[PDB]
Structures are given as structure tokens and as C-alpha cells.
Amino acid sequence: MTNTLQVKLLSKNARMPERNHKTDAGYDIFSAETVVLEPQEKAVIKTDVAVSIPEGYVGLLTSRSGVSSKTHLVIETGKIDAGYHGNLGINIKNEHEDDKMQTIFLRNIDNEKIFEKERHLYKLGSYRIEKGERIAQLVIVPIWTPELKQVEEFESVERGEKGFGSS
Amino acid sequence: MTNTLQVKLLSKNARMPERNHKTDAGYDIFSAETVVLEPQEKAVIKTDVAVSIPEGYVGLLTSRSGVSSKTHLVIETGKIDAGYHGNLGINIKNEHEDDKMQTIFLRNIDNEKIFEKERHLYKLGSYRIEKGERIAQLVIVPIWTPELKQVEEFESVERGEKGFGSS
Amino acid sequence: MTNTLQVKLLSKNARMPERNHKTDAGYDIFSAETVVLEPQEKAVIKTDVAVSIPEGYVGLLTSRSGVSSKTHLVIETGKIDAGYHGNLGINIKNEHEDDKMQTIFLRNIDNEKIFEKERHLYKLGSYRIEKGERIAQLVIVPIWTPELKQVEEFESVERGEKGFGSS
Ligand SMILES: O=c1ccn([C@H]2C[C@H](O)[C@@H](COP(=O)(O)NP(=O)(O)OP(=O)(O)O)O2)c(=O)[nH]1
Ligand SMILES: O=c1ccn([C@H]2C[C@H](O)[C@@H](COP(=O)(O)NP(=O)(O)OP(=O)(O)O)O2)c(=O)[nH]1
Ligand SMILES: O=c1ccn([C@H]2C[C@H](O)[C@@H](COP(=O)(O)NP(=O)(O)OP(=O)(O)O)O2)c(=O)[nH]1
Ligand SMILES: [Mg+2]
Ligand SMILES: [Mg+2]
Ligand SMILES: [Mg+2]
Ligand SMILES: [Mg+2]
């Protein structure tokens, strides 16, 4: 049949993607690892989840408005090709500045201070993404993949070359 | 009928979205508030506009090439679910560095200095987004929302696990 | 016929976009110029390539997971309107911090040090994008462009106003 997406859990640490509502457009993706990201630090957070997006579609592995509005964790949107059967990685950076100051509080993905019994010194603006937290979503859209034809001029001429804030 | 989108203006400060051309793919969104963003400062700029995206679609509340190329104002693309009837917020950050230096000129969304009769000291790289300025656009695309089926291996095996700059 | 996209090479420095696989969702875009980007520096890298996206579609000129995961080069996704026949520009920023330190090594788009016989002093975190390197991709998706109808309340009431990390 159609209207079905294959998903493969690559470890015990993985979790099956879930739609929040029937109305909602994507599936929440869970982190399969606990990671501390210092200011300006980049990482590819593993999900231990693979999918088989069929042809004529592309998967947008993208941020959640809750995480992106509350924290300086920035997720560059991954375009999951209709073929990539590997481990989905979340391309992330802590875009907080490295101002050289210290603190004893990490911050969670809701920007709340993490209280812990054992005291540790962290760089200010550091985040902990915990195993099993919702940090991304996958929205699947159809694509158009025609063959390209080189030309010296186009088929028809109103917008033209105007762009980059021309109105 | 179909081919119609409901829009609700939540205040006098709101404005109806507009297509720039017939050719263009999205609707320009207007700020309903005047906001100053210092370097590294994050905000959710209200539009006082709500919409009812019908099911099988998602709305991409996204940047304009003019604003994003000229300024360090970065808009994280919001995915407006086919259901969210609330106030559309523009998830924004001033990604200019906080170098500790001062100036008397704010900068507008075209990166032009704002001249004002009364002198004030601002942090360098600060922006003023004025009420009624075009700061974002909404592009609506169809989505594919199938039911997920867990598997141990996929239906067919060429790309495979290769990614993250493998070619 | 349909299922064809017109492309126009605006100079000798341009190159025709290419699909990596048959499975893949987009066309790799090549830089038509050699550019050095210092920390925090913004640019619009020219491709010397134009396209005619037909109506009912939009082109996402977007990052590659290889470049974005390995370097601090951030590409803001351009929405190419179904009409824009101009030179496609890659809206890019070097999001590496300006920590005031120096080095003799530029970095390429794989984050590898560039060894050169003549010694030069660069700012730390500077990148060289060379003419003919793959720095972006174009994914084309269909759009929905209805006429807007203003209302005081919506046609039907479960999600409602809930958002920005409400679950
Ligand atoms: O965030 C991401 C982005 C991409 N990917 C995977 C999916 C995609 O099929 C694959 C390659 O994506 P891109 O074509 O955008 N990156 P690049 O062109 O550099 O790699 P390749 O040379 O393999 O195409 O990497 C992720 O798992 N997470
Ligand atoms: O920039 C934005 C992003 C999202 N939104 C709204 C639209 C969407 O329906 C809602 C939730 O979007 P996400 O699912 O991407 N964020 P999150 O998953 O954190 O919130 P929720 O738990 O409500 O799904 O927030 C905005 O108004 N502006
Ligand atoms: O990265 C980009 C982004 C946009 N563009 C072009 C394509 C698009 O048709 C045109 C305008 O895009 P936007 O509507 O998103 N920018 P803006 O609304 O500021 O400019 P205009 O006033 O011309 O619509 O600029 C690029 O070439 N590269
Ligand atoms: Mg959600
Ligand atoms: Mg526009
Ligand atoms: Mg920054
Ligand atoms: Mg590719």
C-alpha cells in the first residue's frame, strides 16, 4: 500500500517518532544521547532512527518553535533525501556567545536552570540535551524533480531580475 | 469553496498579508509592534494576525532575502500547523556580536542609520523593527502525513547510509 | 512539454546544476567566485545561474549538511519565486566568533586547513569558498497560493492558540 512510512530503530536508545495532534504537520524526533553543548559548540546529535522516504518527497528535519525561541540552540534544517536509510542526525549549534564567564548551572532545552547536588563549573550559556527529549521534528513535503534544459533566454519575460528587497 | 485562506486580525495594530506579485510564492507579514533588538537579543515579534491553514498543508513563516542579507536579524522558520489559530509570532534573534562598543545610531531593517533629533546611546549593532514594516513572509506547501510502520529492514536497498558530505 | 526547468548560465564562471543521485531531492549549486569570509562577515555569493521556476512552485536555495555541519558557514534559505529570472545569490554568513586571534591557515568548506607556499596572516575562523565548489542545493516544492478572506472567527474550533512548546 501507499500512505505508510518505514522507520527503523537502530538501538535501544532510539524512540519512535510521534505526531502531537491529528492536525499537526510533522513527527517529533527524540535525542538518543545526552549531550552538553558549550557556547559556539557544534554537533550532530544522533537519533538512532532511520527512515525510507519514498521518491517524489523530501523530509525537512527541522527545529521546534519552543526550543528555538527559548534557547540559543539553532538547528540547521536537514533535507532528508528519498533514499537516505542512515541514522538521522540533528545538525545543531549553541549560538550563545562565549563571553568567558562561568556558572554552576547548565540550562535545559526550556532554558530552565538544572539543579544538581554535586557542584560543577560550566561555561555560561551551556546547554544539556538529555536522552529522550524532543528536540526536532520531521515534516515531509512533495518535490518537483524535472530534467534541466540550458537556454540563452527564457520562454517568457514582470519580476525579472528584481530581488533582495526590491520592493 | 476551496482555494481560500481564513485570516483574523487580532488588533488595530495588525495588517492583512499581501502577495507582492501574482508570480510570487508567499504573503508578506507585517510587524504589529515597534521593537529594539540589541546584539544577541531574542524575541517573538507579534503580528496580531491569526490564520487557519487547512489539513494536508503547513505554513512556512520565513525570512525575506532583503532583511536577512542586509542585517544580522535571523528569523528561524516557523512551521505553522494546520490547526494553530493563535497569534503568529516571528521567532527572531539579532545575531550581531556584542563587542561592548556604543553608538548614537540604531539601524533599520535595510541596515540604514536612523537619524533622530534627541540623542541616545545604543549598543553597536542594535536594530529597530518599526510597527508596520515587512519583516517576514508566509509560504504554504502541501505535506505528506502517513502512518508509521516500524521495521527491522527496509523494502529495498544506492544511497544507503551515505550522507553529511559523502560526495 | 512539462517536467522541464529552464536554466541560463550568465557567464563562463557558471556551472550547470546537477542531481547527485536519481533518488536525491535537489540540484547542487556551484559558486561562480572565489571568496574569503572573515568571522561575522556576510555576503551574497553569486552563482551566475538563473532559472525560471514555473507558477505553483517555489525553489528552496538551501544549505548542504556537509558544509553546515563541518563549518560555521550558515546559509539562510532563499525562497526563489516562480518568476525571478535573475542571478541566484547564496545568502551566507561566517558565524564563527571574532575572538581577535590570528593564524596563517584559512579553512576550506570541509573545515580542512589550506596549505599555501606564500605565508599570509588571517583572522582565526576565516573561510575560503573557491570558484566551482558545491556550497548549496536547490529543492523545488509545490505551493498553495489561495486568496485571503478576512474573518472575525474561524470556520471550526483542538490545537487553537496553543504553541511555542505547549506540550
Ligand atoms: O540534518 C541532517 C541533514 C542531512 N542528513 C542526511 C540526509 C541526506 O540524505 C544526507 C545528505 O544531505 P545533503 O545532500 O543536504 N548534504 P551533502 O550534499 O553535503 O552530502 P551528500 O554529498 O551525501 O549529498 O544527509 C541528516 O541525517 N541530517
Ligand atoms: O515562528 C513560529 C513558529 C511556530 N509558531 C506556532 C505555529 C505552530 O502550530 C506552533 C507549534 O510549532 P512547533 O510544533 O514547531 N513548536 P513546539 O513542537 O515546540 O510546540 P508544540 O508543543 O505546541 O507543538 O507554534 C508560530 O506562531 N511562529
Ligand atoms: O538567497 C536568495 C534569496 C532570494 N533570492 C531572490 C529570489 C526571490 O525571487 C527574490 C526575492 O525573495 P524574497 O521575497 O524572499 N526577498 P524580499 O521580499 O525582501 O525582496 P522583494 O521585495 O523583491 O520580494 O530574491 C535569491 O536569489 N537568493
Ligand atoms: Mg510539535
Ligand atoms: Mg517578497
Ligand atoms: Mg552568533
Ligand atoms: Mg547533495
TrEMBL record, chains A, B, C:
InterPro entries: dUTPase, dUTPase-like, dUTPase-like_sf, dUTPase_trimeric. GO terms for molecular function: dUTP diphosphatase activity; magnesium ion binding. Its EC number is 3.6.1.23. Mg(2+) binds at residue 95. Keywords: Hydrolase, Metal-binding, Nucleotide metabolism. DUMP 2 binds at residues 65, 89, 137. This is dUTP diphosphatase. It comes from Staphylococcus phage 80alpha.
